[PDB]
Amino acid sequence: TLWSRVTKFGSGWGFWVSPTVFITTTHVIPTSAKEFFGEPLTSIAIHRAGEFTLFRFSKKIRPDLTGMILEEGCPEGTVCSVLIKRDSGELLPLAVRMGAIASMRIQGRLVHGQSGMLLTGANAKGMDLGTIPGDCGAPYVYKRANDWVVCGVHAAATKSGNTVVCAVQA
Amino acid sequence: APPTLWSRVTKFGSGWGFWVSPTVFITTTHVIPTSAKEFFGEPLTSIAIHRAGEFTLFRFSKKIRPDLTGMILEEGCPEGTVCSVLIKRDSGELLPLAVRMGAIASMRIQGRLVHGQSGMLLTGANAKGMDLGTIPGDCGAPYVYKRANDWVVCGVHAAATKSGNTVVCAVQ
Ligand SMILES: Cc1ccc(CNc2cccc(C(=O)O)c2)s1
């Protein structure tokens, strides 16, 4: 299942692309650490691009997994799924219609990534129909031919929880 | 979704059912074991059954779930209502799948004739597979939504298209 790749990390979540590759949102990462998942920070490559961070481990941390396709966002009009895990034990896949890459003003801060709008729309008044701040690092995925593609990580949302930003690679 | 609603979702037959109150249990007709003569330690003779197609309601002559309060059961919901389908999956994983509800429909789904309130999943481009969509084992899971200040149950999961986003909620 895709869902066993979504992992609690720092102040949010991350996603196992492969046995050695983990992606997350830069702001959720601990600022004090000597190891992650039992490997010394000494042995980990860190590639940061604004709110997107990729970790490459020097041994197989998740040898139960196959490697997946990671791409720099997706075409406009693609309906992605954001794979949200909650501390409650809920799994909440939500449909997101994707638009252009932009630098957007979101609750008083500038965030660069792929814009999206949830298909739940109008509102939520309902934590099960929108994102909350704790959800940052959740992956954006879609099916293409036979394959799941991951195309970024949850970086920010407006107060409704219904306009979102997907941070992307490079 | 609140813990008091997940606590009402009970493994039953080939799927699930749902406690509306201490004495009322609803489910999808085809998940009921056809040989069964006893439910929650009560003989069939002491149970009132109300059945309409894929919707079945059991009413007991004593309190089976006294920890619960009675809640509101309605005959489906207004067109445009966004519901959550409360699906339990392998390992205390809880999957509240978001569905936009539409018209009362009759459909042919994988060859079987089904009737109830139709809806479209809001989980992805299409919901094929178990990560974004429903499976036969989910049948009898409740459709719920929050009003004003409270939660309503308006039916039970009866069927879904294999390659698609369309579900059917059986209704009272
Ligand atoms: C073999 C399949 C994999 C997934 C299927 C679609 N879901 C679904 C849910 C609930 C009842 C039904 C039904 O066809 O009764 C289908 S069908």
Author numbering:
A (entry chain B): 4 to 173
B (entry chain A): 1 to 172
Could you give the paper's own sentences about this structure?
Two non-covalently bound fragments were identified in the active site of the protease named as J01 and J02, as indicated by their omit maps. J01 forms several direct hydrogen bonds with the side chains of Gln110 and Arg112 and makes some additional hydrogen bonds mediated by a water molecule. However, in the presence of J01, the β-hairpin adopts the same conformation as the ligand-free SV3CP, suggesting that binding of this fragment does not alter its conformation. Since the carboxyl group of J01 appears to hold the β-hairpin loop (residues 109 to 112) in the closed conformation, this must help to prevent the enzyme from adopting the 'open' conformation that can accommodate the substrate. The benzoic acid moiety of J01 makes many hydrophobic interactions with the active site residues including Pro136, Cys139 and Ala160. In kinetic assays both J01 and J02 showed inhibitory activity against SV3CP with Ki values of 0.37 mM and 0.34 mM, respectively. Since J01 and J02 bind in the active site cleft and maintain the closed conformation of the hairpin, they are good candidates for developing further inhibitors and linking them into a new compound could also improve the bioactivity.
Viral replication requires a 3C-like cysteine protease (3CLpro) which processes the 200 kDa viral polyprotein into six functional proteins. The 3C-like protease (3CLpro) was named because of its similarity to the picornavirus 3C protease. It is a cysteine protease which shows a typical chymotrypsin-like fold containing two domains: a β-barrel domain and a β-sheet domain separated by a groove where the active site is located. The active site is characterised by a catalytic dyad (Cys139-His30) or triad (Cys139-His30-Glu54) and shows a strong preference for a –D/E-F/Y-X-L-Q-G-P- (X can be H, Q, or E) sequence corresponding to the subsites S5-S4-S3-S2-S1-S1′-S2′. The key role of norovirus 3CLpro in the processing of the polyprotein and the absence of homologues in the human host make it an excellent target for antiviral drug discovery.
